[PDB]
Structure formats: structure tokens, C-alpha cells
Amino acid sequence: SMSVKKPKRDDSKDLALCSMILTEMETHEDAWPFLLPVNLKLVPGYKKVIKKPMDFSTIREKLSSGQYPNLETFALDVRLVFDNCETFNEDDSDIGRAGHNMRKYFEKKWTDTFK
Numbered sequence: 673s674m675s676v677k678k679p680k681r682d683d684s685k686d687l688a689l690c691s692m693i694l695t696e697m698e699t700h701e702d703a704w705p706f707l708l709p710v711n712l713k714l715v716p717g718y719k720k721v722i723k724k725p726m727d728f729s730t731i732r733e734k735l736s737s738g739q740y741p742n743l744e745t746f747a748l749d750v751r752l753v754f755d756n757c758e759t760f761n762e763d764d765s766d767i768g769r770a771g772h773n774m775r776k777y778f779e780k781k782w783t784d785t786f787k
Contacts, residue, residue, distance in 0.1 A: 686743045690735060693781050697750070698728055700777060702770040706753055722760060726752040743786065750778055 697703060709727045712719045731749050740746045757771035 683743070687735075689785055690740070690743055690746045693778070693785065694728065694732060694735060694750075696781060697774065697778060698732070700774060702773045703728065705757065705767045705770050706774065718760065722756050724752060724756075726756060728753070747782060751775070754778075 698707070706728050708729050710718050710722070710725055712725070718725070726749050731746070731753070734740060734749065735746065740749075754771050754775040757767065761768040761771065763769070763772070
């Protein structure tokens with residue numbers, strides 16, 4: 673509360689460490705459905721159904737331009753990418769499986785780097 677603070681957690685490396693995680697997600701072999709924004713002209717249903725599209729390249733631009741106020745807002749966009757994927761793709765599809773694999777990969781790196 674006013675003039676009463678928990679001890680200051682060192683967040684000075686968060687930007688660099690989120691960049692490294694995002695590099696590792698970018699270079700994963702199952703990243704291909706997620707590298708670029710879904711083409712809203714060419715994919716029927718996507719625009720109407722997925723209210724907040726997100727992809728790795730859009731995260732990378734947000735990261736590089738100081739549009740994440742903290743590491744939690746960064747994790748929210750990464751998870752959004754996988755939540756969108758599960759909303760639109762059957763579990764038993766290449767893209768559906770890709771999304772599950774990447775979410776697992778992400779969540780481990782997140783825990784190991786920060787928890």
C-alpha cells in the first residue's frame with residue numbers, strides 16, 4: 673500500500689530474456705503456423721471468429737518497440753497465439769498438434785527462466 677512495498681524483484685534483464693525465449697520459439701521446427709499473421713483475406717472464417725489475432729512476428733515487433741509494459745503482458749500474447757490456434761484448428765491436425773507442442777515448449781522455458 674502507500675509507502676509499504678515488497679522487496680524489489682530485479683526486472684532489468686526481462687526484455688533480453690523474453691527476446692531469447694521468442695528466438696527459441698521462432699526457430700522451433702513446429703513454429704511455421706505461427707511465424708506470420710494469418711492472412712485474413714485468404715482464410716475464410718478467421719477474421720470473424722478470432723477476435724484478437726496474434727503471431728510471433730507481431731510479438732517480435734511489439735517487443736522491439738517497447739509495447740510490452742512487463743513480462744506478464746508478453747506471456748499473455750504468446751499464450752494468445754496458442755489459444756487462437758486451438759479455437760480454429762482440430763487437435764488432430766498438423767497445425768493443431770503444432771500448437772500444443774509449442775505451448776508446452778514455451779511454458780517450460782517460461783518456468784525455467786522466471787519461476
